[PDB]
């Protein structure tokens, strides 16, 4: 039995190989990334709060261009706040049913493996009525960005950036067909990956608010 003895040993060695393969962390890598993103969100909301009240104080003392920039700042503030809290509701939908580990203060990142809580956004190759509401919210946010920020030459860079950052159109897959947006970015993902990308959108919204703020007070 020449190859046999080989196969009886290498069976358990490959068990050890798979055990070294499956253990690791990989999926749990988002949890440090989601934690860094959420800490960046918690920092950016505070520094942009100080930025908006500094621009508010400046528009209170020297009104005019500061007042018009503060009006645009408050409009993007309200639209960004509505989009931020809506993305937060989608995120709490994304982690619905996953507790904390009490002592560690970290979610079971090994357990948040499937995206089986937001199956109510797709039907086969189409969406549901909720996913169409999400696409409507994203397009409403992109359009009120484009409508609050006018045709100013200083702001067209961030208009083109949010059109780049929040493109909604079909993207080609690896096989070369078109594919709808939330089916491409979320259908089948892990839930911690979904909350990670939604917090990336939150970081994008706070970054956009920061850019229009420090370009607004510079204006």
């Amino acid at each position: 039995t020449p190859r046999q003895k080989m196969i009886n040993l290498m069976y358990l060695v490959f068990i050890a190989m798979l055990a070294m393969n499956v253990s690791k962390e990989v999926i749990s890598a988002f949890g440090l990334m989601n934690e860094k993103f959420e800490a960046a969100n918690t920092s950016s909301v505070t520094t942009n709060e100080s930025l908006l009240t500094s621009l508010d104080q400046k528009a209170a003392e020297a009104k005019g261009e500061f007042a018009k920039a503060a009006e645009t700042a408050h409009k993007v503030q309200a639209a960004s706040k509505e989009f931020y809290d809506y993305i937060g509701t989608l995120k709490t939908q994304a982690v619905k049913g996953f507790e904390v580990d009490k002592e560690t203060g970290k979610m079971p990142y090994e357990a948040m493996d499937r995206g089986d809580n937001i199956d109510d956004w797709f039907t086969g190759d189409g969406y549901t009525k909720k996913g169409n509401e999400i696409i409507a919210k994203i397009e409403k946010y992109k359009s009120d960005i484009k409508a609050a920020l006018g045709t100013d030459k200083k702001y067209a860079g961030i208009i083109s950036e949010v059109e780049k950052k929040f493109d909604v159109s079909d993207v080609k897959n690896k096989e070369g067909i078109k594919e709808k947006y939330l089916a491409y970015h979320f259908k089948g993902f892990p839930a911690i990956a979904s909350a990670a990308k939604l917090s990336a959108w939150q970081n994008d919204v706070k970054k956009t608010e920061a850019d229009v703020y420090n370009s607004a007070l510079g204006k």
């Binding site: 358990l12 068990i15 798979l18 055990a19 499956v22 253990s23 493996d113």
Partner: protein
């Protein structure tokens, strides 16, 4: 050397607990204070003793 009853049962039970341990490790499901790795290690250990003490008789 050990008994034939405690040879085949040890070999089979060790070859089964390693499989259910690999199952516990690929699924993140532990019930009690087992967590797979304990079961996987006791499976590899119980097969290590079989590969050890069956290296003494070539009987054919």
């Amino acid at each position: 050397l050990l008994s034939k009853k405690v040879m085949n049962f040890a070999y089979g039970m060790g070859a089964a607990v390693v499989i259910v341990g690999a199952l516990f490790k690929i699924t993140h499901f532990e019930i009690g204070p087992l967590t797979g790795t304990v079961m996987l290690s006791i499976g590899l250990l119980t097969e290590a003793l079989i590969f050890a003490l069956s290296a003494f008789e070539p009987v054919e």
